[PDB]
Design a protein around this ligand. Structure first.
Ligand SMILES: *[C@@H]1O[C@H](CO)[C@@H](O)[C@H](O)[C@H]1NC(C)=O
Ligand SMILES: *[C@@H]1O[C@H](CO)[C@@H](O)[C@H](O)[C@H]1NC(C)=O
Length: 328
């Protein structure tokens, strides 16, 4: 066992040492390697050539800025690779292609601005992919073609401006998708057509104005949709016909004015809803919603208050409806 490193087994724990590069190990058959919280700034070719048998490799919390071609070559048995909390901004197209058994890949908290379309090719056994807290602006149509077994994808806290129109291919088994805290403007739910195993979709804290659906299709597996804190003011009358089994819908902190009876008649499988913090107009228009709320038997965590007109401001939707004879 190499200097400054304590080894519990064939696993090597070299965290918090004053390391500036990967150490040469006498023992080459190590199963794991942890180099957390060091001062590594660069990953060389075949740096891990000695550690062929490595199954997990932790390199988080380093100052890594440059990753050479073939940095991870020869690591066929590696199934977890953590590279979060570094200064990575470019990755060569061949950088992961040898990691054929990889299962968890973590690249969050890096300075990535774009990704080579073929970056993740051949990562068939990948299950979770963490790309949170990066500066990505776009995402290649062909990027996820091969993630045949991915079921968790995190693209939150980035700078995504748009969603590619024809491209979620290869994510047929994905269950949970995080797109929160980006900069999306519109949502066309037809764009998610390929994700036919999704249970949960997080879209909170974007800049979404519109909710539309261009294709008529049925998303039977979607059960939770978090749209909290957007700028939604308009919704196409069929976007929820698409989600018959939707059970949790959160639309707090938006700019919703009203909800059509056509919309609400498609939200009958809900068990939890969120409509607080909006711009509701307590006029004759709100009857569809008022009627829906009384009929409802599920949860809402925060009271849903009227915004307009001035003499209804701050009052419960139902209290205002029955108080002021707005409906029926
Ligand atoms: C990888 O990117 C480099 C750009 O430096 C390019 O020359 C090379 O052809 C690419 N390889 C593949 C397989 O696309
Ligand atoms: C959303 O659609 C409405 C009407 O369909 C339109 O007024 C508005 O410009 C659209 N929003 C965007 C961001 O294009």
């Amino acid at each position: 066992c190499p200097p400054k490193c304590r080894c519990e087994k064939l696993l090597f724990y070299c965290d918090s040492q004053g390391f500036h590069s990967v150490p040469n190990a006498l023992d080459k058959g190590s199963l794991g390697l942890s180099l957390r919280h060091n001062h590594i700034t660069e990953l060389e070719r075949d740096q891990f050539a000695s550690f062929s048998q490595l199954t997990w490799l932790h390199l988080d919390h380093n100052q890594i800025s440059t990753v050479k071609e073939d940095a991870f070559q020869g690591l066929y048995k590696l199934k977890e690779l953590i590279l979060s909390s570094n200064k990575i901004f470019y990755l060569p197209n061949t950088t992961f292609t040898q990691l054929i058994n990889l299962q968890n890949l973590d690249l969050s908290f890096n300075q990535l601005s774009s990704l080579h379309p073929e970056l993740f090719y051949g990562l068939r056994k990948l299950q979770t992919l963490h790309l949170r807290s990066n500066s990505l602006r776009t995402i290649p149509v062909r990027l996820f073609w091969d993630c045949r077994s991915l079921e968790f994808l995190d693209l939150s806290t980035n700078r995504l401006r748009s969603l590619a129109r024809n491209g979620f291919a290869g994510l047929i088994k994905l269950r949970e998708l995080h797109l929160e805290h980006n900069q999306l403007t519109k949502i066309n739910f037809a764009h998610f057509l390929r994700l036919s195993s999704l249970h949960t979709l997080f879209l909170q804290w974007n800049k979404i104005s519109n909710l539309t659906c261009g294709m008529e299709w049925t998303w039977g597996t979607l059960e939770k949709l978090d749209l909290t804190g957007n700028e939604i003011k308009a919704i196409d009358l069929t976007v929820f016909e698409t989600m018959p089994n939707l059970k949790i819908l959160l639309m707090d902190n938006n700019k919703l004015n009203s909800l059509d009876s056509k919309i609400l008649n498609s939200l009958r499988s809900l068990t939890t809803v969120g409509l607080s913090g909006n711009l509701w107009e307590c006029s004759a228009r709100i009857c569809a919603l008022a009627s829906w709320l009384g009929s409802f038997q599920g949860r809402w965590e925060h009271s849903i208050l009227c915004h307009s007109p001035d003499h209804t401001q701050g009052e419960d939707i139902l209290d205002a409806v029955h108080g002021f004879q707005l409906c029926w």
